[PDB]
Structures are given as C-alpha cells and as structure tokens.
Design an enzyme around this catalytic site. Structure first.
Site, PDB file in Angstrom:
ATOM      1  N   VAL A  44       0.804  -1.212   0.000  1.00 45.39           N
ATOM      2  CA  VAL A  44       0.000   0.000   0.000  1.00 45.39           C
ATOM      3  C   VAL A  44       0.840   1.265   0.000  1.00 45.39           C
ATOM      4  O   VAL A  44       2.013   1.245   0.351  1.00 45.39           O
ATOM      5  CB  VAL A  44      -1.035   0.020   1.150  1.00 45.39           C
ATOM      6  CG1 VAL A  44      -2.124  -1.022   0.886  1.00 45.39           C
ATOM      7  CG2 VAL A  44      -0.380  -0.215   2.497  1.00 45.39           C
TER       8      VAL A  44
ATOM      9  N   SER B 200       2.354   2.863  -2.337  1.00 49.85           N
ATOM     10  CA  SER B 200       3.450   2.988  -3.316  1.00 49.85           C
ATOM     11  C   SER B 200       4.774   3.421  -2.659  1.00 49.85           C
ATOM     12  O   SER B 200       5.481   4.291  -3.186  1.00 49.85           O
ATOM     13  CB  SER B 200       3.058   3.973  -4.430  1.00 49.85           C
ATOM     14  OG  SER B 200       1.694   3.821  -4.777  1.00 49.85           O
TER      15      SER B 200
ATOM     16  N   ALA C 269       5.189   5.159  -0.047  1.00 47.65           N
ATOM     17  CA  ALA C 269       5.040   6.428   0.667  1.00 47.65           C
ATOM     18  C   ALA C 269       5.073   6.242   2.177  1.00 47.65           C
ATOM     19  O   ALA C 269       5.545   7.114   2.885  1.00 47.65           O
ATOM     20  CB  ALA C 269       3.741   7.115   0.261  1.00 47.65           C
ATOM     21  N   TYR C 270       4.550   5.120   2.673  1.00 47.51           N
ATOM     22  CA  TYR C 270       4.589   4.838   4.099  1.00 47.51           C
ATOM     23  C   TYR C 270       5.723   3.856   4.460  1.00 47.51           C
ATOM     24  O   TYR C 270       5.849   3.452   5.615  1.00 47.51           O
ATOM     25  CB  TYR C 270       3.253   4.281   4.605  1.00 47.51           C
ATOM     26  CG  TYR C 270       1.979   4.913   4.077  1.00 47.51           C
ATOM     27  CD1 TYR C 270       1.582   6.213   4.433  1.00 47.51           C
ATOM     28  CD2 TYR C 270       1.120   4.166   3.278  1.00 47.51           C
ATOM     29  CE1 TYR C 270       0.381   6.748   3.963  1.00 47.51           C
ATOM     30  CE2 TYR C 270      -0.073   4.680   2.818  1.00 47.51           C
ATOM     31  CZ  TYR C 270      -0.442   5.956   3.145  1.00 47.51           C
ATOM     32  OH  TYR C 270      -1.646   6.364   2.619  1.00 47.51           O
ATOM     33  N   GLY C 271       6.521   3.465   3.476  1.00 47.55           N
ATOM     34  CA  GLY C 271       7.617   2.548   3.675  1.00 47.55           C
ATOM     35  C   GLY C 271       7.211   1.197   3.152  1.00 47.55           C
ATOM     36  O   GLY C 271       6.524   1.098   2.123  1.00 47.55           O
TER      37      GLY C 271
ATOM     38  N   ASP D 157       1.839   8.822  13.316  1.00 45.88           N
ATOM     39  CA  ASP D 157       2.989   9.549  12.706  1.00 45.88           C
ATOM     40  C   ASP D 157       3.682   8.605  11.767  1.00 45.88           C
ATOM     41  O   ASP D 157       4.410   7.668  12.213  1.00 45.88           O
ATOM     42  CB  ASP D 157       3.957  10.023  13.742  1.00 45.88           C
ATOM     43  CG  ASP D 157       4.998  11.021  13.153  1.00 45.88           C
ATOM     44  OD1 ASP D 157       5.267  11.042  11.943  1.00 45.88           O
ATOM     45  OD2 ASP D 157       5.507  11.789  13.954  1.00 45.88           O
TER      46      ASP D 157
END
Ligand SMILES: Nc1c(C(=O)NCc2ccc(C(=O)N[C@@H](CCC3CCCCC3)C(=O)NC3CCCCC3)cc2)cnn1-c1ccccc1
EC number: 2.7.11.24
Length: 341
Positions: free
Chosen positions: A26, A28, A30-32, A164
């Site tokens: 999930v 792409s 962006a969240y690692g 966060d």
C-alpha cells in the site's frame, strides 16, 4: 510460536505468521514497507509494516525501540494502537527484522480536504477527536510535534486516529513558531498550534500558512497573529531571535472574524485561542475539549488520560546491541489487546 510463511514483495522479503494472509503493498512506498493483509484471527483487514534497517546504527536502533515503546503504550480510540508485533527470529542472536501490525486506516485528511472544504459539523467532530487523542498523549508527557493532515487518518464513519508515518504536505506549514526558531521555551501546546492550522484549513479549504522556508513561514504567521508585544519579547532568551523579531516592521494582530469570514463564531473564537504566539497563553487540549464549539460532542466522563509512560530511556547513550536487546524484550513481552467485533 506460530508458523511463518515467506514471500517477496516490491523488492523486499516478507516473513509473516500464517495468521496474516493476502499481503498487498500500500501507498506505493510512501509509508515505507507496509502491506494490507487479512488477519484470519478476527477476519479484519490490517496493515503490516516491516521496519527498514531497524538496527543499522545506534540511532536507528534507538528509533526502533522508541517507536515500539510508544506504540505499546497507546490505548485510546483516537490514537493508533498496536495489534501485534512479531519477528521470524527464534532468538536474540537471529533477531534482525521487526514487523508491526495496526488497523488499516481508510484515508488521511490531506486526501479529504483536497476533495472539498468540510461542513462545520464535520469540522467539529474531527477536531474534537484530535483534541481528545491529544489530551491522552499529552497526559503521558508525550508531544506529537509533527501534526499535519497526512498524520491523521479517518475511516468512512469519520472516526479519526492520530499517527505519525514519518518520512506534498510540508511539516513547516503546521509547526509552532517557538520550535521553528529557537526550540527552547516550548511545551505540549506546540501540538495545539498545529491543530489550529489544521482546523483553519478544514474550514477554508486552504493551507493557512504555506511558507517556503522558516523565514517566509514566520512572516506569514506574524501577518495573522501580529508581531510579539513587549510581554512575549520579555520571554525570548535567544538574542539573535529577539533581534530578528524586533528588526521587522511591527505588524498588528488581525481580527480573526475578518479572516475566517462566514465561519461559525465559536470556531473563530477557538482559533483565536489556539493560534497565539505565546505558548504559555495557548489553550491546552483538555481546555479546548470544554470550549463551547464542541458542545455536541464533549463528555468530560469519556475523555480519558493515559497511564504514565517511562521516557527515561531517551536520556541514555547505549550500543546498537543494547538497543537491539531492549527492543527484543519488548517484542517478547507484548500482550495482544482484547479482540473487538
Ligand atoms: N499506511 C497505513 C498503515 C500503517 O502504515 N500502519 C503501520 C503504522 C506503524 C506505526 C505508525 C506510527 O504512528 N508510529 C509512531 C508511533 C507513536 C506516535 C503515535 C501517534 C501519537 C504520537 C506517538 C512513530 O513512532 N512514528 C515515527 C516513525 C519513524 C520516525 C518518525 C516517527 C503508523 C502506522 C495503516 N493504515 N494505513 C493507511 C492509512 C490511510 C490510508 C490507507 C492506509
């Protein structure tokens, strides 16, 4: 110990308990390294995050420990919580990978305000939930410090959780002036400044203070809130900062009612209480919950504080293997939360 299965996803090895099925990347990256997965124990979707190079250095090791301690502490409706934490390793000697499981959240507020400005009822409810989670965090002497719309998640039901994600939407735009200058005389109310910036944006559809850098940021702020008076100037210990401030062409505080024109006056009043330059005068989260703007939601019997949180580790200087060992202890001691449906 459960049975693990191995796979590869988007350049990374993933070794997870059979409990978690149907892993799907999930965000792409962006969240690692985060996958959606189906948790067979509850039949709910979850997110599984594999930490990247958790023990690469002393500082990563400490960061890893810090994140795990914080996640294990948080038990509140409006704060992300930890469903599970695991490693495929059987011993401290083999220990190298840490996976965290949380609820799969629906969308962030960046990707909801960028759909439309919200109704005043929706604003009331989202800000109320932010403040309720902050009352909780702040009660344990934890400061978020990085509140912004991409760090708030909201399902279809408008239930909101503070998180966060770490490293579009710049931090500086939501940051309190005292910790984007000197970083000296600050308290938990840095988070309240951020909530005012978020609330403004939800009400208007526009970033309140879209500065290009710390100087421009500050200039945009002072244009709304006015340049510090003598009383605030008395409390600035930094001399270069005091010199800078006093070097500017003095600017008056705006009447917020003329800036947020047509907004609910109770919203405007609460914004006046949150976006004050002096951190000793800014409203706390507990005080803001009791503001008349939240009359429909506020329940002083259902706004709980947190258990105390031992932050004494933050002052320690330890070796990588020590931080690693402590993190192992925390994985081992994890008690899963009560299952809900
Ligand atoms: N992408 C995801 C996830 C996901 O990634 N989950 C795992 C996870 C793990 C930890 C934290 C997390 O918040 N750490 C914190 C914990 C402590 C923090 C909590 C909030 C109060 C203040 C304290 C954390 O320590 N920060 C660090 C991360 C590295 C360094 C910077 C900050 C957040 C998520 C879940 N849903 N979705 C999703 C969201 C919207 C749409 C679609 C999908």
């Amino acid at each position: 110990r459960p049975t693990f299965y191995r796979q590869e996803l988007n350049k990374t090895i993933w070794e997870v308990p059979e409990r978690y099925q149907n892993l799907s990347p999930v965000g792409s990256g962006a969240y690692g390294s985060v996958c959606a997965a189906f948790d067979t124990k509850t039949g709910h979707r979850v997110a599984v995050k594999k930490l990247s190079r958790p023990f690469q250095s002393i500082i990563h090791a400490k960061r890893t420990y810090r994140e795990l301690r914080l996640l294990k502490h948080m038990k509140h409706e409006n704060v992300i919580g930890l469903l599970d934490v695991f490693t495929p390793a059987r011993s401290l000697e083999e220990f190298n990978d840490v996976y965290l499981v949380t609820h799969l959240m629906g969308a962030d507020l960046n990707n909801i305000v960028k759909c439309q400005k919200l109704t005043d009822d929706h604003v009331q409810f989202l800000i109320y939930q932010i403040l309720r989670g902050l009352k909780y965090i702040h009660s344990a002497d934890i400061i978020h410090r990085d509140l912004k719309p991409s760090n708030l998640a909201v399902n279809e039901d408008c239930e909101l959780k503070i998180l966060d994600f770490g490293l579009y939407v710049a931090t500086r735009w939501y940051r309190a002036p005292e910790i984007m200058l000197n970083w000296m005389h600050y308290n938990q109310t840095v988070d309240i400044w951020s909530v005012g910036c978020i609330m403004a944006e939800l009400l208007t559809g526009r970033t309140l203070f879209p500065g290009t850098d710390h100087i421009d940021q500050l200039k945009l702020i002072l244009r709304l809130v006015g340049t510090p008076g003598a009383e605030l100037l008395k409390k600035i210990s930094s001399e270069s900062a005091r010199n800078y401030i006093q070097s500017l062409a003095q600017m008056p505080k705006m009447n917020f009612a003329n800036v947020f024109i047509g907004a609910n006056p109770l919203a405007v009043d609460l914004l006046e209480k949150m976006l004050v330059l002096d951190s000793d005068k800014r409203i706390t989260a507990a005080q803001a919950l009791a503001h008349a703007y939240f009359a429909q939601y506020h329940d002083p019997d259902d706004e709980p504080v947190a258990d105390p949180y031992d932050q004494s580790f933050e002052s320690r200087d330890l070796l990588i293997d020590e931080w690693k060992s402590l993190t192992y202890d925390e994985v081992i001691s994890f008690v899963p939360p009560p299952l809900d449906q």
